[PDB]
Design a protein around this ligand. Structure first.
Ligand SMILES: [Mg+2]
Ligand SMILES: [Mg+2]
Ligand SMILES: [Mg+2]
Ligand SMILES: [Mg+2]
Ligand SMILES: [Mg+2]
Ligand SMILES: [Mg+2]
Ligand SMILES: [Mg+2]
Ligand SMILES: [Mg+2]
Ligand SMILES: [Mg+2]
Ligand SMILES: [Mg+2]
Ligand SMILES: [Mg+2]
Ligand SMILES: [Mg+2]
Ligand SMILES: [Mg+2]
Ligand SMILES: [Mg+2]
Ligand SMILES: [Mg+2]
Ligand SMILES: [Mg+2]
Ligand SMILES: [Mg+2]
Ligand SMILES: [Mg+2]
Ligand SMILES: [Mg+2]
Ligand SMILES: [Mg+2]
Ligand SMILES: [Mg+2]
Ligand SMILES: [Mg+2]
Ligand SMILES: [Mg+2]
Ligand SMILES: [Mg+2]
Ligand SMILES: [Mg+2]
Ligand SMILES: [Mg+2]
Ligand SMILES: [Mg+2]
Ligand SMILES: [Mg+2]
Ligand SMILES: [Mg+2]
Ligand SMILES: [Mg+2]
Ligand SMILES: [Mg+2]
Ligand SMILES: [Mg+2]
Ligand SMILES: [Mg+2]
Lengths: 109, 142, 135
RNA sequence: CAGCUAGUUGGUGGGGUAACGGCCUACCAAGGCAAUGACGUGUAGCUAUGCUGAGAAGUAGAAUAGCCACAAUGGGACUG
RNA sequence: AUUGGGCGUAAAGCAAGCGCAGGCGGAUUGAAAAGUCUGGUGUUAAAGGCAGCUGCUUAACAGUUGUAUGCAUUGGAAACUAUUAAUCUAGAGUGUGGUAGGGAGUUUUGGAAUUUCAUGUGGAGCGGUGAAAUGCGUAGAUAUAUGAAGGAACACCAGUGGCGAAGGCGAAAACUUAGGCCAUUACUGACGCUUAGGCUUGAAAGUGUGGGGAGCAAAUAGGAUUAGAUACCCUAGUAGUCCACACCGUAAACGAUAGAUACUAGCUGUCGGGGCGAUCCCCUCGGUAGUGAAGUUAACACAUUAAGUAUCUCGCCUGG
RNA sequence: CAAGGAUAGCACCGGUGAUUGGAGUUAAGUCGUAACAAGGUACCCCUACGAGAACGUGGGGGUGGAUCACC
RNA sequence: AAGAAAACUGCCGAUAAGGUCUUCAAAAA
């Protein structure tokens, strides 16, 4: 265990992805797919807390996000749950970048 | 003027025809596509270019005025990644979706656009909310 | 499948079966009809007691018992606890359960209820096995 | 559970009913329902509601409240 | 699993086709306003439900005010669907012009090869096997040469192939007949896709009647092997395999992948029509294969002939 | 007019029944070794017959078959 | 010079029951 522990430790240190938060939560509802694992993430009002359980709850706490609605619609393998959760959070679109591209006004309608 | 060489065909359902064309062009990084022109399809393209997902949409007619085809292009940035992320049609043939104004959907918390044709042709979800009138829901575009 | 296909033949839900079916039958006796009324626990006489070996992983002598519930249905039941008194004609009260090793038994002989003396010399888990207070 | 229905379908004159009405009568006809499920079987008082569910809904129709039906079983009528 | 699932290898695409009713469905114009949206009015009993307040020592609880959901009627909206009145050809068909096929049925014909019989030569084995033995042979077998009869199947051609919806189709000819590909300045003008029920076809085995029977061979007999052999081997051997007319309607009936429509890199083959004109090769339109990225998958793998991006319709699946 | 009674034959549903058929569960039994490797006769599907039994053989259908091989 | 080269088959059946074994990363003056 000690060996494998520190191995995975350094491993995550190497592969670290960058996450952006909006008011502590996730901006838009998203479904993360990885194999046969599908994880649904939904924006939450400030106060509900992390309604996640298992791999998703660990990810949400470790990412920084507070309020988050989740449901595991697929398998219960921790590796695939982490894969599906990270895929859903990485495909997220910022409210800013969209309009920039889209040639609109910052967030204005 | 614009000439072609290939025959232009279209599926019978005018919303998902466009959606399949758009998704395939987006996935394959293709730019110029063609399809048969209908007033509903023309009108839906009218609201999309004001909201900014495609650049141009050109409809042409024959010398006899019996057939028309609209040829639109997508808005790719310099690095070649599109503005459309995903399109999904709700009111497919057979099962038509009717939602009142109070139950008008919000696509991706307002980032995407919902196409709703209430009584004066297609209209985006936000302006539909402004008019406090609802109706037919064509497709989800984000 | 398809909207038209499902409109014609809707989705039929799978059924649900009980685990203690013999416990939900009440005989009126005046008409001799069997109605389906759920009941927590019922009563039954006894028509055979002895030993029977278990399934595969577990091998040990075990006590079983046949019963004739208030209604007209016979089911094999296991004699729980250590020490027994059944003698081919002792009333008993039965509840739900499932002994994994023995195939067919799906009820437990409630201890210390009618003609079954509670297993004495029992402290821990004395409520389940019908025992009062040694103090 | 694939045919069911012979006062069943319609008209005529009359009677009866608080009232319309094969509700009943005599005559004249042969229709009516049914694969979009008649008919038959089994089951059950219905609803507002109770419990559960993010929702769509699932489930039981405690108490109580609305409506219906019943008063040992099966029929008839008086009074009003 | 309408929201909210799947059917190549895990349960699940009927064997295939012709298909009525049903569902879905090209483009444009006009009307109506049945869906759809919206305004007004009525109602949806009270209690309960959610929000606020009060009263019980606060609560539980009780009261209090607020709080929807649907239906009907009326007044408008006309984008889509539905209805009706019409126009158009791009869908689908028809004709003309090119054209490839073992597509099917009926009737005739032909040659190798086996068997039997007939006639010669001939003289001791032949046959069979892991090794042998039943068996055939001086009544002259096997072999060799010629001839006759009869039944069944059609070497080579024959394929990194063709046709049909599937099962299937391969000697030659005639008659009848089905579908398909390419180009259309022609024509009708949405006549189209799917299909519950229904109808047609549907390998081989099997059935009934009447023929036929060369070879082969379930069942059966014998000789081997074996601890035993009702099996694998050998020698015999009936039904059957064949034809006509009637049934049976099942197969790993498999591309383990329903049909239709639009789009999505490329490369290598091969076949057909068309364009050029020795082949060869180039291009176009299609059919049949290999390799292969995005994409999909649990993986194997699929990948323009999808299991990819999507729609319509039908069939089917819900632990053993 | 008519509850009820008697007679009469059909219709539907239930219980039980000598005897008998298979089925699951099971103790370690009794005869083979059919399948998984080329499982020692490749396997599997449909069908007909036969045999203590798994199964054998004939006809058709498939590779969800091994070995084999090509510079 | 274009060669090849060739399989071959006797017989060969069975193996009583239930059974360990991963303790753990908290992380270390
Ligand atoms: Mg009742
Ligand atoms: Mg739920
Ligand atoms: Mg009540
Ligand atoms: Mg009650
Ligand atoms: Mg009483
Ligand atoms: Mg599933
Ligand atoms: Mg399967
Ligand atoms: Mg098939
Ligand atoms: Mg099948
Ligand atoms: Mg057809
Ligand atoms: Mg039709
Ligand atoms: Mg249209
Ligand atoms: Mg109320
Ligand atoms: Mg209250
Ligand atoms: Mg000869
Ligand atoms: Mg046959
Ligand atoms: Mg014999
Ligand atoms: Mg022989
Ligand atoms: Mg016979
Ligand atoms: Mg079958
Ligand atoms: Mg086949
Ligand atoms: Mg491939
Ligand atoms: Mg079961
Ligand atoms: Mg074997
Ligand atoms: Mg052997
Ligand atoms: Mg074998
Ligand atoms: Mg014997
Ligand atoms: Mg045999
Ligand atoms: Mg066989
Ligand atoms: Mg034999
Ligand atoms: Mg065979
Ligand atoms: Mg020997
Ligand atoms: Mg043995």
């Amino acid at each position: 265990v000690p060996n494998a522990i520190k191995k995975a430790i350094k491993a995550a240190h190497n592969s670290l992805h960058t996450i952006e938060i909006h008011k502590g939560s996730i901006y838009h509802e998203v479904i993360g797919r990885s194999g046969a694992s599908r994880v649904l993430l939904k924006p939450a009002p400030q106060g509900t807390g992390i309604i996640a359980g298992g791999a998703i709850r660990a990810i949400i706490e470790l990412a920084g996000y507070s309020d988050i609605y989740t449901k595991n619609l697929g398998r219960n393998t921790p590796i695939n749950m982490i894969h599906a959760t990270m895929d859903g959070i990485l495909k997220q679109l910022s409210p800013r970048r969209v309009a920039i591209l889209r040639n609109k006004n910052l967030n204005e309608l | 003027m614009i000439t072609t060489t290939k025959p232009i065909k279209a599926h019978f359902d005018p919303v998902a025809d466009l959606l399949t064309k758009i998704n395939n062009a987006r996935k394959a990084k293709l730019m110029t596509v063609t399809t048969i022109a209908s007033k509903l399809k023309i009108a839906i393209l009218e609201i999309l270019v004001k909201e900014g997902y495609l650049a141009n949409f050109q409809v042409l007619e024959n010398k006899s005025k019996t057939k028309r085809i609209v040829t639109f292009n997508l808005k790719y940035t310099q690095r070649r990644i599109p503005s459309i992320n995903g399109v999904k049609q709700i009111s497919k043939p057979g099962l038509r979706i009717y939602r009142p104004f109070e139950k008008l959907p919000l696509v991706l918390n307002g980032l995407g656009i919902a196409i709703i044709s209430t009584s004066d042709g297609v209209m985006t979800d936000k302006v539909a909310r402004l008019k406090k009138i609802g109706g037919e829901i064509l497709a989800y575009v984000w | 499948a398809t909207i038209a296909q499902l409109i014609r033949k809707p989705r039929k839900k799978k059924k649900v079966k009980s685990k203690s079916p013999a416990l939900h039958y009440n005989l009126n006796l005046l008409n001799k009809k069997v109605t389906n009324v759920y009941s927590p626990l019922k009563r039954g006489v006894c028509t055979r007691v002895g030993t029977m070996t278990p399934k595969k992983p577990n091998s040990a002598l075990r006590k079983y018992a046949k019963v004739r519930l208030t209604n007209g249905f016979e089911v094999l039941t296991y004699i729980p606890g250590e020490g027994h008194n059944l003698q081919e004609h002792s009333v008993t009260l039965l509840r739900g359960g499932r002994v994994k090793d023995l195939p067919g038994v799906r009820y437990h002989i409630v201890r210390g209820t009618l003609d079954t003396v509670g297993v004495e010399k029992r402290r821990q888990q004395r409520s389940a096995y019908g025992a009062k207070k040694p103090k």
